Design a protein around this ligand. Structure first.
Ligand SMILES: [Mg+2]
Ligand SMILES: [Zn+2]
Lengths: 108, 166, 297, 192
């Protein structure tokens, strides 16, 4: 079926500009308690998540160096160490990954 | 092509007299030839229009559209030029006064319909304009209560005359 | 000490307050620069260049963002809580405190000082003018008790009555009239001589000023103002009066046997706009605050 | 009274005199003790045509080196400037010339101190007061060098630049507060 008449700009402005089509203001937004970079409630802060994913990426690169090739996947717990930081006695059999940094003041 | 929104930042007013108000700062900035349709950009420009600049950045950081990052870049660099060049002293003390979008120069392509037939596909472009004014954001116009409605109705009834006579 | 109508007293009081504030602003001659540092957590290493004895820490939070204006209630100038509208003096390092912080105890004390002072402001203008109201003090009770308290001597004619629920709801509705207008808690740090010259009539205020002036060697007490009310308090306040959202005066209680005359302790509970409670929990907290708080020792 | 070892001061005088010798060897009929008056009035009406925003007179009053150095940051602001009073008679302190044969040009730079009082009131593009103060003769002393290209046959004496001593008092402060932001971090740690 085809239009019988050209819709004017008055009818079009009445359609495409009503509150059902406008963008709704959201108010879930506040500052993150650490780093102040404006998260959303019920959502992890993208800055802090970027921090954690960068450090996790470097740990996974060191794991991939220590495991040699694929299909290796050891049968022991792992644990990471930074510079200094002698292995505790409770982490005896656990795999030791040490990269090189100071231990950051959120990973304890 | 006409570029006058860029030239509005080059107005220079005379020096104000001591017995006068402040005349708040006015900062115009725009980004030309954005690869985005002017209607979809207009919806974001209507979202911002009255808000403060920090609230505008907060709403635009979490809106999931292609134009949101673009307008966030324009508002951030307008804030930077406002603090640096046009002598606004507080970075937060700016509100969006005007916010709109215009058509940019488009290209044309063929669409290759399904017989020996075709359409004219058009590669859409648009602009974004913004005007900042220092000061707190103005309060919204409150909806009229029954007192104002009654006062206007009684004023209407008091206004009428005996028509078509002396 | 003389006969004075209650309005010309507040006229001469706030005129003397404005004279002292004008002198405080006029003593410094020019625009001096101080380099206040940010030793907080979120935006570290920021260093503002401010106007000495003009610029407030609210004017330092306005440089950063709007959220530092919305959520920051107290400043922390080098070791000490500074209320958000007090002009800085020396080149310092600053840090902002919020309600949802880790250790908010100082800003809780500041909030309850401000709410008790608001309750004094709403008590002192609600009684019959042929009766006399003397605002004694607001004793610093801990916030673990349910309510903030303000001490008031009523008239000698009124050693027998106690208000019903309608007078209390009139008090809270006038306090909400106070809240709905967003007023600045203006401070001013004055010498003991000018402060004692302000009041001159309320002997309870006189001994309280002497008590607060006796402990520092410079004899400087802390005056504050909401509009046309002027009161004495220990320590800083919150910036605006619209920060309070749920407000109530709970009851009054009489504590006679320490004194011949009758002092009446007005009690009420409050909660800020960022920490508001559900209606059920709020009615629970309102129910507890009718019991008498006695923590002075 | 003179300090010890006054002969090296006379050697500085000798270097100034052999530079005056070179300018006279090029161009005679050039008096020395009336050049402070030329320096002063060139300086004054240079700053007045800066006040009137008239570039075509500034170009013949000041040189190509300090035309952007005096005209660049003032492009949308308005300056109200006024020389009010000469405190001390100006003095010539150093005359030098360079024989740089890159295109056969020689320049003669006269350094002249001037000790006087001015007013200055820099406004904003919206007309708001920004830096100065309207009607106060605040005093400043400045050592400004002049320069004339000798080999050019027209060659006016134009103000070249001003040298600021390290012991100079800091200028009067701004009327607005200023934020200096710290290090803007990526996901990282702030170490200071
Ligand atoms: Mg075909
Ligand atoms: Zn965060």
């Amino acid at each position: 079926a085809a239009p019988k008449n050209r819709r004017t700009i008055e009818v079009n402005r009445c359609r495409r500009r009503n509150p059902q089509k406008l963008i709704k203001v959201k108010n879930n937004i506040d500052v993150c308690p650490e780093c102040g970079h404006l998260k959303q409630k019920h959502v992890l802060c993208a800055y802090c998540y970027e921090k954690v994913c960068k450090e996790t990426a470097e740990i996974r690169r060191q794991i991939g160096k220590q495991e040699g090739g694929p299909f290796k996947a050891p049968t022991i717990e792992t644990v990471v160490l930074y510079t200094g930081e002698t292995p505790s006695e409770q982490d005896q059999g656990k795999r030791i990954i040490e990269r090189d940094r100071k231990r950051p003041s959120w990973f304890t | 092509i006409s570029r006058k929104w860029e030239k509005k930042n080059k107005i220079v007013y005379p020096p104000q007299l001591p017995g006068e108000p402040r005349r708040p700062a006015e900062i115009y900035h725009c980004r030309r030839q954005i690869k985005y349709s002017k209607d979809k950009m207009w919806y974001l420009a209507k979202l911002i229009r009255g808000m403060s600049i920090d609230q505008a950045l907060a709403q635009l950081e979490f809106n999931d559209k292609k134009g949101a990052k673009i307008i966030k870049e324009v508002l951030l660099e307008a804030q930077d030029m406002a603090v640096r060049d046009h002598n606004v002293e507080f970075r937060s003390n700016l509100y969006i006064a005007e916010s709109t979008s215009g058509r940019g120069q488009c290209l044309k392509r063929i669409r290759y319909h399904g017989r020996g037939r075709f359409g004219i596909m058009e590669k859409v472009y648009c602009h974004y304009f913004v005007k900042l004014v220092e000061g707190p954001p103005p309060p919204p116009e409150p909806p009229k209560t029954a007192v104002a409605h009654a006062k206007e109705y009684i004023q209407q009834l008091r206004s009428r005359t005996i028509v078509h006579t002396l | 000490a003389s006969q004075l109508s209650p309005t010309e007293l507040t006229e001469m009081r706030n005129d003397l307050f404005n004279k002292e504030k004008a002198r405080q602003l006029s003593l410094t001659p020019r625009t001096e620069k101080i380099e206040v540092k940010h030793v907080g957590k979120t935006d570290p290493g920021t260093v503002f260049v401010m106007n000495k004895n003009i610029s407030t820490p609210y004017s330092c939070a306005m440089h950063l963002s709007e959220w530092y204006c919305r959520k920051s209630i107290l400043a922390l100038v080098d070791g000490q809580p500074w209320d958000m509208y007090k002009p800085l003096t020396k080149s310092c390092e600053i840090k902002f405190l919020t309600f949802k912080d880790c250790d908010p105890g100082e800003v809780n004390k500041a909030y309850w000082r401000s709410c008790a002072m608001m309750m004094g402001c709403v008590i002192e203008r609600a009684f019959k003018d042929e009766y006399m109201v003397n605002l004694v003090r607001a004793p610093e009770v801990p916030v673990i008790s349910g309510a903030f308290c303000y001490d008031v001597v009523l008239d000698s004619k009124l050693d027998e009555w106690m208000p019903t629920k309608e007078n209390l709801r009139s008090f809270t509705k006038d306090a909400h009239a106070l809240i709905y207008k967003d007023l600045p808690f203006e401070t001013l740090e004055v010498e003991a001589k000018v402060a004692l010259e302000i009041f001159q009539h309320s002997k309870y205020k006189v001994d309280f000023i002497e008590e607060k002036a006796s402990q520092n060697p410079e004899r400087i007490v802390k005056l504050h103002r909401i509009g046309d009310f002027i009161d004495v308090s220990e320590g800083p306040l919150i910036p605006r009066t619209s920060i309070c959202f749920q407000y109530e005066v709970s009851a009054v209680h009489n504590l006679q046997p320490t004194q011949p005359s009758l002092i009446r302790r007005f009690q009420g509970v409050s909660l800020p706009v960022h920490l508001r409670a559900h209606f059920t929990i709020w009615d629970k907290l309102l129910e507890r605050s009718r019991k008498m708080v006695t923590e002075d020792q | 009274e003179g300090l010890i070892e006054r002969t090296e001061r006379m050697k500085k005088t000798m270097a100034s005199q052999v530079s005056i010798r070179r300018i006279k060897d090029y161009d005679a009929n050039f008096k020395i003790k009336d050049f402070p008056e030329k320096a002063k009035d060139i300086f004054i009406e240079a700053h007045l045509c800066l006040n009137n925003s008239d570039h075509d007179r500034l170009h013949t009053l000041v040189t190509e080196h300090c035309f952007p150095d005096m005209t660049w940051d003032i492009k949308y602001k308005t300056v109200r400037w006024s020389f009010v009073e000469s405190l001390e008679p100006s003095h010539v302190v150093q005359v030098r010339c360079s024989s740089m044969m890159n295109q056969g040009n020689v320049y003669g730079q006269i350094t002249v101190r001037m000790h006087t009082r001015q007013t200055l009131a820099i406004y904003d593009r919206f007309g708001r007061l920004m830096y100065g103060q309207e009607d106060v003769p605040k005093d400043v002393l400045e050592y400004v060098v002049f320069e004339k290209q000798l080999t050019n046959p027209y060659g006016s004496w134009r103000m070249h630049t001003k040298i600021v001593p390290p012991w100079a008092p800091p200028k009067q402060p701004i009327l607005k507060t200023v934020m200096i932001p710290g290090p803007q971090l990526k996901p990282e740690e702030e170490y200071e």
